[PDB]
Ligand binder design. Structure first.
Ligand SMILES: *[C@@H]1O[C@H](CO)[C@@H](O[C@@H]2O[C@H](CO)[C@@H](O[C@@H]3O[C@H](CO[C@H]4O[C@H](CO)[C@@H](O)[C@H](O)[C@@H]4O)[C@@H](O)[C@H](O[C@H]4O[C@H](CO)[C@@H](O)[C@H](O)[C@@H]4O)[C@@H]3O)[C@H](O)[C@H]2NC(C)=O)[C@H](O)[C@H]1NC(C)=O
Ligand SMILES: *[C@@H]1O[C@H](CO)[C@@H](O[C@@H]2O[C@H](CO)[C@@H](O[C@@H]3O[C@H](CO[C@H]4O[C@H](CO)[C@@H](O)[C@H](O)[C@@H]4O)[C@@H](O)[C@H](O)[C@@H]3O)[C@H](O)[C@H]2NC(C)=O)[C@H](O)[C@H]1NC(C)=O
Ligand SMILES: *[C@@H]1O[C@H](CO)[C@@H](O[C@@H]2O[C@H](CO)[C@@H](O[C@@H]3O[C@H](CO)[C@@H](O)[C@H](O)[C@@H]3O)[C@H](O)[C@H]2NC(C)=O)[C@H](O)[C@H]1NC(C)=O
Ligand SMILES: *[C@@H]1O[C@H](CO)[C@@H](O[C@@H]2O[C@H](CO)[C@@H](O)[C@H](O)[C@H]2NC(C)=O)[C@H](O)[C@H]1NC(C)=O
Ligand SMILES: *[C@@H]1O[C@H](CO)[C@@H](O[C@@H]2O[C@H](CO)[C@@H](O)[C@H](O)[C@H]2NC(C)=O)[C@H](O)[C@H]1NC(C)=O
Ligand SMILES: *[C@@H]1O[C@H](CO)[C@@H](O[C@@H]2O[C@H](CO)[C@@H](O)[C@H](O)[C@H]2NC(C)=O)[C@H](O)[C@H]1NC(C)=O
Ligand SMILES: *[C@@H]1O[C@H](CO)[C@@H](O[C@@H]2O[C@H](CO)[C@@H](O)[C@H](O)[C@H]2NC(C)=O)[C@H](O)[C@H]1NC(C)=O
Ligand SMILES: *[C@@H]1O[C@H](CO)[C@@H](O[C@@H]2O[C@H](CO)[C@@H](O)[C@H](O)[C@H]2NC(C)=O)[C@H](O)[C@H]1NC(C)=O
Ligand SMILES: *[C@@H]1O[C@H](CO)[C@@H](O[C@@H]2O[C@H](CO)[C@@H](O)[C@H](O)[C@H]2NC(C)=O)[C@H](O)[C@H]1NC(C)=O
Ligand SMILES: *[C@@H]1O[C@H](CO)[C@@H](O)[C@H](O)[C@H]1NC(C)=O
Ligand SMILES: *[C@@H]1O[C@H](CO)[C@@H](O)[C@H](O)[C@H]1NC(C)=O
Ligand SMILES: *[C@@H]1O[C@H](CO)[C@@H](O)[C@H](O)[C@H]1NC(C)=O
Ligand SMILES: *[C@@H]1O[C@H](CO)[C@@H](O)[C@H](O)[C@H]1NC(C)=O
Ligand SMILES: *[C@@H]1O[C@H](CO)[C@@H](O)[C@H](O)[C@H]1NC(C)=O
Ligand SMILES: *[C@@H]1O[C@H](CO)[C@@H](O)[C@H](O)[C@H]1NC(C)=O
Ligand SMILES: *[C@@H]1O[C@H](CO)[C@@H](O)[C@H](O)[C@H]1NC(C)=O
Lengths: 317, 171, 172, 318, 171, 318
């Protein structure tokens, strides 16, 4: 005499709990994870150009510590610095080290052009057993340790114009002897001085004689400085002692390069997003792997999971 | 949900309705049957896929940034670097928490809404030939074999064919 | 609101309903009365407490941060410290403004919805024995004493018992 | 013969106004405030360890200005600096004062360990009537003012290894005399120099002779510097004059400590959230008391009130 | 939309309704006609203007800030200034994107809701004198001339006057 | 014998596409743009006081490069620096140039008060052919190049108290000669020094001697420094050579002033919001014209358009 017709919706035996405006946990039939929380642990070598520093920091590769000269003229999208890196040349420091590391990293290249600096009246290419190159004493590949010739060290006064259409980065240094015997024996003057300038900027550094802690047999130090010369400007270097001279300049580029500290292995595989823990997929909008990232990456959030409902309320009973 | 159908006047879900999200079950003289409703199912699925695709679209691409871990104590500048990053992370974390709360509230309401719309549409087809029993079911007051049921499911049911029979039975 | 019940087909609220948020008033052969509906009232209260508890959960704990007031002019680094803080405050102030606007819109709509759901549920129990008068009231077309009213209110009303009487009154 | 059954909802004679997406003001039956806008005006001494600096800044306590030596070896979760603080020792400056203050405040302790430096051929423990300790001339408790012995001041060259498994903070200084007569009377050499280094860092300071404004009788100054030495590293101090020597090191810690400027009194009461205005409750998600906070605190916002509806629309009349 | 009226049981909008947002078309013994419903139209317009005024209220005012473009390479401090600005812009860009998405979803639902409310209100006036044909139209089972139509449009229709006639025709 | 009554809503032949939570593009009857993406390209000269620097940077107007003499005592809400600006005075640098530019721009004035500094035993008002004022040699108007008188340059030791109720900004410098011969010829002492101090702060600079690239005939340079002196504090300057002396102070203010780099022309018109591209309206909440702005401005976003629906779904067809 009749019929019944019922309307209804599906359910599953075990759905997924999600959060809403009004509920901290409510069950829906299905959801999807919005927070990337895992990595393979390996940094993929495509599509970004990865340069593994191995035993070298970027600054040691820049200066040309002999065991880092393998990196001469190299380029990268991402330079990867390892915790095992070590220095093995003349002990040095870099005032504002972090800034020099950052600007070279961002430039993305160690392309170096040697220039024909003339150093009249001094001895060039000094070296040390703290910085062996082969079996013999040596020095940073990109720096030129000048000392006296005969019994004098004259006032050096040299210029190098920038007649190119890009900015030149010059890396230079100042030697701090540990004793007066050492100062006068190397540079004749009892006190030295190094002045490096352009039309728009200048730096004068006075060396400081004294003992620092023994490093690789030496209580003496070199301080590293840098100078950028724009197209049409000119570099002048003036010194009556203690100059660690540049041999040329690094070409400065702009682009997408950077640097990351990581001990993750590099693998042949493809991933847009790199973290120090390894590459991570970027299909999700958020991630909780690491606040440090490079490339097209989900945004870092504190939550280790956030579920987006993709089905209705689950009401199996 | 806002509409009161799912987890409401529909007492529970159907684990046996595997080929759709919403649908019809019937009992008539020929036995019982079930069929998914494609249009309502597809409307929910399309909205949810729309939502999902807006959300997982295009991560940002960032290259050289600031340092975020430090091996030496430095004071003022490092305090500021860490504060800027912590501030950023807390704001994005808030954005992510709020986004899923709002989305999920809305997904539960839109799915409830689609159930309710299918219910309303079915009732409107049946006109004076059926009564709403209150539990998502219609009592149909005329003989309604399988072809007749299918005519309701496929939107071609002609209420006038059955109205005299149905009214006699109801009143 | 979206559902059109509160401040809609229900013309106004009842200041005299002091023991529930939603409920019933009736008139029958035994007089008039009022009763709160406990389930609808608790559903609204539970949703509101749910959203309140999500909002007032877990302040952040922060310890050493940056300085935010300065006694000397310094230029670039101070400019940046102040900008970072001003930027942060403006973003949180925006989050706070938006959060209460969205929550409040939704609280109004969910309470309107609960009114509408109760009305629809009541209608469905009554079947062919009553008609919607269009102002949130049902005209019930049969004698319906206090126990009958209570059967509607508690969800056990048996429409078949009264159907013959009601149809005779509605249609003849 | 029938009945009527009406559905309805409650209302109250006057509710509360709130904001929505579509309305700047709409009345609901009830709401709750989400912005904390008041404080008692007192900082609660629990649960955080509060150290009231009273007449002392954290840097004066660090250096050991005599009226601040009450603070020797003290610790804190929050150090409270008062506007009435004053210095009363040798006049000094700290290049990057803010950073030293910050890093000490964050370390959360003034624990100090004296080390047996040997200073061969100089006089130790110099003092000044600018820095009285009890009735006599004195000096900062953590610093050691070295001067000539007899008619000479040799090249000092001393080392102190860090063989511990924590970082050491060394505070030291350089004296700038106001005249050449002072320079030579004290240090013999016409120009001094201080170089302090570790295995990967170095700082050399050359004193600069000349007058600064007269402060507590003196037109000379001391400049304060600091050096952190990690486990396995070593400190070397090399000077031929003008060194204000360390006596030892401060033990560095990491943790939740900080510092705040406030003149609010400190009460016996309990509150997780501290602002310079006083403690505030942290039950609400936002606050408009102060952007400066310490602890588990609502987020600072510009609004002085934000109401969350907790009831339906209030519609007592048509 | 959530309510199933616009782009739903009402199959399409009317390009010929040029003096209102929502309204009525009829057919009776005196011909056909169309009229806008002023209250529903004004409720939708007022809510939309309310939300617009909230969004375009009060731009912030800022004066001396930080530098945002740089002519020389500097390293750490500049990296930080740029990161702060880029972080701020990404957060505001996200707020803007989300604000219009939420606002627009809500405008579509509130306009759908107003259409549905008008429909329900009309059905409720008509009581037992009409049936919902399922496409947003009511079949009225009694002679309903122009004055009668207007009584519905203006909320004064008295169902009792026509009930006997209507019931005779329906049943 | 009946009637039909249909409910419906309007539509238009073509609406506007907007975004929602569920749709990247859906058509509604109407929408309004929330991103300001255009400018006239001109900076309106009201309501903010705009000062066009023309051929001068703010620092060159501060120091008093002769071709910037017209800016003496100027004031601004917004100083506009042009890309055509150039320096034409003694070659100089400013360690932390950005900070000096910022704090001057923020103070909003070059109001300068000359003070009666006495410089006993030196020659004042040195000039250079690198810094001509007319056809003759000159120097920065606000600075005083001191050199030997007769055969000596005595130690300068001077003070200037701040007995006013506002902060004083002092600009001064140090001369870096190119040779020792220049050094001794000008200042007699073989190495100079400049110490400028207040009660709680000091700066000490030692000049740098050496050749540098010629700029307007000169291998020598000046470095610029600055010292703020608060009410009740004092300035002391002590030098035995190479001092580029202050002539007085700039009055410091706080307020809404700033600086912007722009080549946009200034026009007579009114607009609250200024970008380097020109003024823009501020009726919209967002803008994509420039992240650099000044005044009551929409917030910068990356999107070039964002449409807010202001009507229903447009459904002219089934
Ligand atoms: C390089 O140039 C600077 C700046 O001119 C000189 O510095 C001044 O040096 C003088 C002399 O030392 C200082 O004079 C001293 O002032 C003290 C502060 O005085 C204040 O308080 C007193 C008392 O309450 C008031 O009367 C006065 O008005 C101030 O409010 C005084 O307390 C000192 O007095 C005591 O010592 C002096 C001298 O020994 C005696 O005359 C007194 O009787 C008393 O015993 C004293 O007068 C002055 O403050 C310095 N000014 C600044 C700005 O620093 C350098 O001296 C100069 N250097 C060289 C090498 O020439
Ligand atoms: C200023 O004081 C400084 C600190 O006292 C003096 O520096 C010291 O100078 C001596 C003499 O050269 C150095 O002695 C050498 O040390 C190396 C390294 O020793 C360490 O490692 C080896 C091998 O692992 C181990 O055997 C030792 O126990 C140490 O662990 C030795 O290899 C050499 O044979 C030699 O003895 C000191 O290392 C050095 N100390 C520091 C901390 O730098 C300095 O000489 C003084 N200057 C003047 C002018 O007197
Ligand atoms: C140290 O070396 C620098 C750079 O080589 C020398 O600077 C040069 O000095 C000469 C001689 O005065 C300048 O010559 C001038 O050139 C201009 C043309 O622009 C001309 O008009 C003049 O008549 C004059 O000949 C030259 O420009 C300048 N070069 C640079 C790059 O600055 C400086 O002379 C050396 N210093 C010492 C002490 O030797
Ligand atoms: C639960 O929801 C997710 C998201 O919609 C579904 O995952 C998608 O499924 C399709 C078909 O397998 C894949 O091609 C997509 O790549 C998936 N998207 C995501 C975000 O993972 C999942 O299939 C659903 N689960 C069930 C049981 O239906
Ligand atoms: C290191 O890289 C630099 C920069 O690219 C090389 O310099 C260029 O070399 C090529 C080939 O000789 C020339 O065509 C370019 O004109 C050079 N650039 C400049 C600016 O001089 C340099 O040759 C590389 N060094 C080595 C050893 O390979
Ligand atoms: C990615 O690496 C980070 C950094 O090493 C890991 O975070 C550390 O995890 C350990 C163990 O939980 C903690 O003790 C450290 O304090 C964490 N450091 C920080 C800064 O959070 C992280 O767990 C790694 N994640 C994955 C997925 O591999
Ligand atoms: C809707 O359902 C009806 C009922 O099943 C369909 O019409 C029948 O189709 C079957 C199989 O093709 C035939 O055996 C009958 O002759 C048909 N009966 C009628 C009443 O026509 C109809 O094809 C369906 N319509 C659509 C659009 O799918
Ligand atoms: C908490 O203290 C702060 C800082 O002193 C007060 O903020 C100052 O309030 C006065 C009067 O309103 C203003 O003139 C100042 O500009 C404010 N200073 C700053 C830096 O904002 C604040 O009013 C106090 N709040 C409470 C609730 O006591
Ligand atoms: C406002 O001016 C800015 C800055 O010049 C313009 O942005 C530059 O536009 C050019 C051409 O599109 C790009 O190559 C540059 O990369 C942009 N610079 C920056 C910093 O973004 C911008 O187009 C101008 N806007 C308007 C509307 O005039
Ligand atoms: C419902 O009300 C009826 C009438 O008063 C009563 O018999 C019954 O006990 C009630 N049932 C419940 C579930 O309370
Ligand atoms: C309650 O009070 C306010 C004034 O504070 C008034 O404007 C508002 O209309 C009142 N509400 C009601 C429901 O009357
Ligand atoms: C108003 O709402 C709050 C928050 O839930 C509650 O604590 C308070 O008691 C309520 N007041 C009334 C009148 O119910
Ligand atoms: C100061 O604290 C240190 C580190 O805990 C402790 O070893 C030392 O003995 C303390 N000195 C005094 C005087 O208590
Ligand atoms: C409503 O409609 C009728 C015409 O059918 C008219 O007589 C009456 O005045 C109208 N009322 C209003 C309020 O317009
Ligand atoms: C479209 O929307 C805006 C904002 O309300 C309005 O100013 C404009 O006139 C509208 N145009 C139409 C066709 O209504
Ligand atoms: C600059 O203003 C000051 C103070 O009002 C005044 O003494 C001085 O003469 C002014 N200079 C010029 C160029 O008018």
């Amino acid at each position: 005499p009749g019929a019944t017709l019922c309307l209804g919706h599906h359910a599953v035996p075990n759905g997924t709990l999600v959060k809403t405006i009004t509920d901290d946990q409510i069950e829906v039939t299905n959801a999807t994870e919005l927070v990337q929380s895992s990595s393979t642990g390996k940094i993929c070598n495509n599509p970004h150009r990865i340069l593994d520093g191995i035993d070298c920091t970027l600054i040691d590769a820049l200066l040309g510590d002999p065991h880092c000269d393998v990196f001469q003229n190299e380029t990268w999208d991402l330079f990867v610095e390892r915790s095992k890196a070590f220095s093995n040349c003349y002990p040095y420091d870099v005032p504002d080290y972090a800034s020099l590391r950052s600007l070279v990293a961002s430039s993305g290249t160690l392309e170096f052009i040697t220039e024909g600096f003339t150093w009249t009246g001094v001895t060039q290419n000094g070296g040390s057993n703290a910085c062996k190159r082969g079996p013999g004493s040596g020095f940073f590949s990109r720096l030129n340790w000048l000392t006296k010739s005969g019994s004098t060290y004259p006032v050096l006064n040299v210029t190098m114009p920038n007649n190119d259409n890009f900015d030149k980065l010059y890396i230079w240094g100042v030697h701090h002897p540990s004793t007066n015997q050492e100062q006068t024996s190397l540079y004749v003057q009892a006190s030295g001085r190094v002045t490096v300038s352009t039309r728009r900027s200048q730096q004068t550094i006075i060396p400081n004689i004294g003992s620092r802690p023994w490093v690789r047999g030496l209580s003496s130090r070199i301080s590293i400085y840098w100078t950028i010369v724009k197209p049409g400007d000119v570099l002048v270097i003036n010194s009556n002692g203690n100059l660690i001279a540049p041999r040329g300049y690094f070409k400065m580029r702009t682009g997408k390069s950077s640097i990351m500290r990581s001990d993750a292995p590099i693998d042949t595989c493809i991933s847009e997003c790199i973290t120090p823990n390894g590459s991570i997929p970027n299909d999700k909008p958020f991630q909780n792997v690491n606040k440090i990232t490079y490339g097209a990456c989900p945004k870092y959030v504190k939550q280790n999971t956030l579920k987006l409902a993709t089905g209705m309320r689950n009401v199996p009973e | 949900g806002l509409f009161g159908a799912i987890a409401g006047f529909i007492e529970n879900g159907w684990e046996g309705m595997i080929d759709g999200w919403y649908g019809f079950r019937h009992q008539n003289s020929e036995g019982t049957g079930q069929a998914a409703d494609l249009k309502s199912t597809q409307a929910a699925i399309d909205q949810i896929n729309g939502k999902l695709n807006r959300v997982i679209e295009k991560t940002n691409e960032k290259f050289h940034q600031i340092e975020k871990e430090f091996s030496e104590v430095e004071g003022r500048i490092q305090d500021l670097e860490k504060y800027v990053e912590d501030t950023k992370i807390d704001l994005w974390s808030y954005n992510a928490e709020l986004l899923v709360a709002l989305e999920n509230q809305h997904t539960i309401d839109l799915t409830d809404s689609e159930m309710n719309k299918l219910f309303e549409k079915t009732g409107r087809q049946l006109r004076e030939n059926a009564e709403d029993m209150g539990n998502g079911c219609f009592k149909i007051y005329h003989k309604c074999d399988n072809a007749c049921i299918e005519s309701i499911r496929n939107g071609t049911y002609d209420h006038d064919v059955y109205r005299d029979e149905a009214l006699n039975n109801r009143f």
